[PDB]
Design a protein around this nucleic acid. Structure first.
Ligand SMILES: [Mg+2]
Ligand SMILES: [Mg+2]
Ligand SMILES: [Mg+2]
Ligand SMILES: [Mg+2]
Ligand SMILES: [Mg+2]
Ligand SMILES: [Mg+2]
Ligand SMILES: [Mg+2]
Ligand SMILES: [Mg+2]
Ligand SMILES: [Mg+2]
Ligand SMILES: [Mg+2]
Ligand SMILES: [Mg+2]
Ligand SMILES: [Mg+2]
Lengths: 88, 119, 73, 101
RNA sequence: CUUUCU
RNA sequence: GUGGGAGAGGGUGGUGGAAUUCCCGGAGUAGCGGUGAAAUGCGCAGAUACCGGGAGGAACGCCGAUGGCGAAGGCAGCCACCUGGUCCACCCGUGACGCUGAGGCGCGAAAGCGUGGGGAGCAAACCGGAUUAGAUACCCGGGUAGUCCACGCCCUAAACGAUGCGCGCUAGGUCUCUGGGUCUCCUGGGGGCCGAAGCUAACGCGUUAAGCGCGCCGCCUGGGGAGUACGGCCGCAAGGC
């Protein structure tokens, strides 16, 4: 799983300011984490479809959040992507 | 011709014919009777009456090896089981104990059609 | 009826999670390694649900029976 | 790491030596895999509900360790290897759910 | 056991 | 976000006992089996019934429900690992980031197909017994594909609640599963039954709407011809749309 450590380490790592638990960045950060762990799990267990849906949804939630970010602050966007390491 | 005195009495009941097998204190059968063993050939073989005559003959044949005390073990439900047990209870032998030991599966083999339509 | 007495009643506070208290678990099986129904175990959905799991872990270890022979009939 | 409870049932016919020898390979393996022994209970012999390997009795061991979860399954392949070890069962520790209290 | 048609 | 919770939700590996079949050994005879009756069938190369040992496959009694989980198909022995969803409390953070969704992509019971493996029980076809006016059936004795695993394909269904999704609004009562609480009840999530208002052709529905409304999608337009013909797309094929 993802230890509380692994988690908060990320929350702080992206937060906009001390206390920022749910900014668009923090969220997109945390998702990318879960997504990658899961994307990983499925590299194996290609037959675990039931879990795949979950992924299919986590992605949506993410790309949807980013869409919003791009629209609002395009700067923070380019900023975030490049960082997190999304797209490609 | 061994003189066992005490041992087991296995009763195998079924809706198709009873069949009693008397054994020694650790399993090896001394004698055995059934609906067939005695007259009865087809349908009657099952009947509780048959079960009686089989239980008796089973014991009589057992009285030969000098049987006296027996532990009854019933298996399966069927046309006269309690009958077979009463017969033994009379006969000569002393029925020390009786036990239902019918085998049930913890769900293993698909039963033939005739036994499905359940669940 | 089946109101002999709830198994839970005739007993003190025990750890339902303990897969080794053969002493007490012994109490939730009938005259066969069968796990008693709730109207006998006097337990409750959640409890009765964890009871079952405990009892099985035991059976495996070899502490509780999977099935006894009925003595009567 | 997670806290587990290992269960072991060996041949109840081992003499002082053989018996303590098994505890050797066991104690060994536990560590060889990362099992940090948090304590033990050794009830020894007990009357089994049914026979385990013709044997109608058993010698029970019980250790509660703390080890890297990613190796629990292997640690038990190992424990099962021994011929006198006829029962192995590793359980995730859990808070004692009481009742009748 | 089965047991058509009118 | 922090802290908790229940769970047959999914994937991999491991393992437990009951039963069936087969094989070996003991003990033991004349039958067993099966039906409405029977017969085929199996048995003196010794069966059935009984005990001990072994090999193997498949499913997982009780708990078990009127229960739970999942988007649906579906999911129940036990253990560990990997992993999805969902609910509650605190109200801490972002600040409309929302809803629906033609096409797309994915999932999709069973049967079926391709390659390889497996094969205990069951069993289309088939080979027999019986019943019958006849029996290509029902009942009985056998039995191949298949049912099982792997990888790939098929994409259908009474795929059902015969009821698309989301949000707001409109008496209560009772039972139930899971969470919180000031815990003989209140509060949130879920499953049932009876019912206000109202709705409906009626049956019934009734805060789990089939009521009152708004948004977006799919669909219908008498029956037969016919889910057929044609054309197109998909499939190895069967066949699908
Ligand atoms: Mg989860
Ligand atoms: Mg706030
Ligand atoms: Mg603000
Ligand atoms: Mg399919
Ligand atoms: Mg199939
Ligand atoms: Mg095939
Ligand atoms: Mg057959
Ligand atoms: Mg047949
Ligand atoms: Mg409710
Ligand atoms: Mg009214
Ligand atoms: Mg109603
Ligand atoms: Mg073609």
């Amino acid at each position: 799983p993802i230890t509380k450590e692994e988690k908060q380490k990320v929350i702080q790592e992206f937060a906009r300011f001390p206390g920022d638990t749910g900014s668009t960045e923090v969220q997109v950060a945390l998702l990318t984490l879960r997504i990658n762990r899961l994307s990983e799990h499925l590299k194996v267990h290609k037959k675990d479809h039931h879990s795949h849906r979950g992924l299919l949804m986590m992605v949506g939630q993410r790309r949807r959040l980013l869409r919003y970010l791009q629209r609002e602050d395009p700067e923070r966007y380019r900023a975030l992507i490049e960082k997190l390491g999304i797209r490609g | 011709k061994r003189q066992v005195a005490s041992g087991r009495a296995y009763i195998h009941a079924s809706y198709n014919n009873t069949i009693v097998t008397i054994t020694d204190p650790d399993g090896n059968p001394i004698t055995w009777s059934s609906g067939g063993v005695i007259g009865y050939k087809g349908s009657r073989k099952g009947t509780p009456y048959a079960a009686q005559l089989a239980a008796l003959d089973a014991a009589k044949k057992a009285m030969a090896y000098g049987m006296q005390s027996v532990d009854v073990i019933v298996r399966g439900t069927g046309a006269g089981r309690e009958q077979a047990i009463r017969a033994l209870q009379a006969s000569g032998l002393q029925v020390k104990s009786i036990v239902d030991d019918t085998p049930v599966p913890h769900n293993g083999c698909r039963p033939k059609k005739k036994f499905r339509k359940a669940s | 009826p089946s109101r002999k007495a709830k198994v839970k009643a005739t007993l003190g506070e025990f750890d339902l999670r303990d897969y080794r208290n053969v002493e007490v678990l012994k109490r939730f099986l009938s005259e066969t390694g069968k796990i008693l129904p709730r109207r006998r175990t006097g337990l409750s959905g959640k409890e009765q649900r964890i009871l079952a799991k405990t009892i099985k872990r035991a059976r495996i270890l070899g502490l509780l029976p999977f099935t006894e022979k009925l003595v009567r009939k | 790491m997670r806290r587990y409870e290992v269960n072991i049932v060996l041949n109840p016919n081992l003499d002082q030596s053989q018996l303590a020898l098994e505890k050797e390979i066991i104690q060994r393996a536990l560590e060889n895999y990362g099992a940090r022994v948090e304590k033990v209970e050794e009830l020894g012999l007990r009357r089994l509900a049914y026979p385990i390997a013709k044997d109608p009795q058993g010698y029970f061991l019980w250790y509660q360790v703390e080890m890297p979860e990613d190796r629990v399954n292997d640690l038990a392949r190992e424990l099962r290897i021994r011929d006198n070890v006829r029962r192995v069962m590793v359980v995730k520790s859990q808070e004692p759910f009481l009742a009748n209290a």
